[PDB]
Amino acid sequence: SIIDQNVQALFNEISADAVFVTYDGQNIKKYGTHLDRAKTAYIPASTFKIANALIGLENHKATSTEIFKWDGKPRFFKAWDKDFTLGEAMQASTVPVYQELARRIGPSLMQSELQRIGYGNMQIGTEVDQFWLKGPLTITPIQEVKFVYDLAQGQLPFKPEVQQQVKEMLYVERRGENRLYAKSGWGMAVDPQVGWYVGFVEKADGQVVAFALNMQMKAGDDIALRKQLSLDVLDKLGVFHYL
Ligand SMILES: *C(=O)[C@H]([C@@H](C)O)[C@@]1(C)CC(S[C@@H]2CN[C@H](C(=O)N(C)C)C2)=C(C(=O)O)N1
Numbered sequence: 542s543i544i545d546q547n548v549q550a551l552f553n554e555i556s557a558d559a560v561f562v563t564y565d566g567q568n569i570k571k572y573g574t575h576l577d578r579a580k581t582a583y584i585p586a587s588t589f590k591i592a593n594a595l596i597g598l599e600n601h602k603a604t605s606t607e608i609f610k611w612d613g614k615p616r617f618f619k620a621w622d623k624d625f626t627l628g629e630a631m632q633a634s635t636v637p638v639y640q641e642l643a644r645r646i647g648p649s650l651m652q653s654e655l656q657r658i659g660y661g662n663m664q665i666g667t668e669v670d671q672f673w674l675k676g677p678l679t680i681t682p683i684q685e686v687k688f689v690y691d692l693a694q695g696q697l698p699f700k701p702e703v704q705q706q707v708k709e710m711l712y713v714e715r716r717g718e719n720r721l722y723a724k725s726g727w728g729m730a731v732d733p734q735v736g737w738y739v740g741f742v743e744k745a746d747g748q749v750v751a752f753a754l755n756m757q758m759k760a761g762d763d764i765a766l767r768k769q770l771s772l773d774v775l776d777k778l779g780v781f782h783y784l
Pocket residue numbers: 585586587588633634635636674725726727728764765
């Protein structure tokens with residue numbers, strides 16, 4: 542089609558290895574300059590916040606109303622120097638809040654919950670507040686896309702109210718009837734550094750298009766490029782047209 546061409550021509554602009562995967566419940570579609578990336582496992586980085594919230598709510602280690610208090614030790618960013626709910630930390634990608642959550646879960650529950658749902662290679666090593674940021678946990682774009690697809694459908698192995706709560710922590714914007722949910726990620730502590738823009742689009746007519754951008758990142762890159770590249774693709778596909 543000409544849709545594909547317009548989509549690929551977008552990537553013909555970008556000088557970084559990238560793949561963009563879509564999943565509608567039937568077919569995987571892959572776009573970008575390095576298609577092989579879709580099958581390659583990278584660290585989830587801050588995309589793991591989705592499964593961290595799920596496991597934590599499912600196992601009574603937090604609620605979506607509980608306030609995670611700033612403990613006075615300044616954080617990497619100044620925007621992180623306050624109190625957060627898990628939903629608020631989800632949009633601000635507040636890492637220390639989600640590290641506290643991982644420490645509340647602990648290594649034994651975290652491991653067995655990840656085996657139970659089959660998330661990536663299901664490997665955490667020895668530091669329970671670090672495995673998604675530096676490894677050994679890794680996951681393919683195809684796996685991320687099918688994961689967030691089931692989330693949107695309520696079909697993950699978690700209580701339906703728990704998926705509903707983490708789902709709405711991901712809500713970004715709606716255009717007329719169509720809803721966009723998304724989570725970004727930048728694993729800087731690894732070589733190569735990996736960028737993520739995972740999420741989905743919920744039509745009003747029930748249908749769901751999950752998506753996963755995965756690209757290589759350089760120190761200094763445009764922190765906004767992951768989201769603006771994904772919205773351009775989704776518009777070129779006709780899944781989430783610009784207004
Ligand atoms: C997660 O992947 C990553 C590490 C520290 O866990 C994290 C939280 C840092 C960044 S960069 C920074 C956080 N949010 C900012 C942003 O996107 N905007 C629009 C201001 C930049 C990210 C990231 O996803 O970019 N995640």
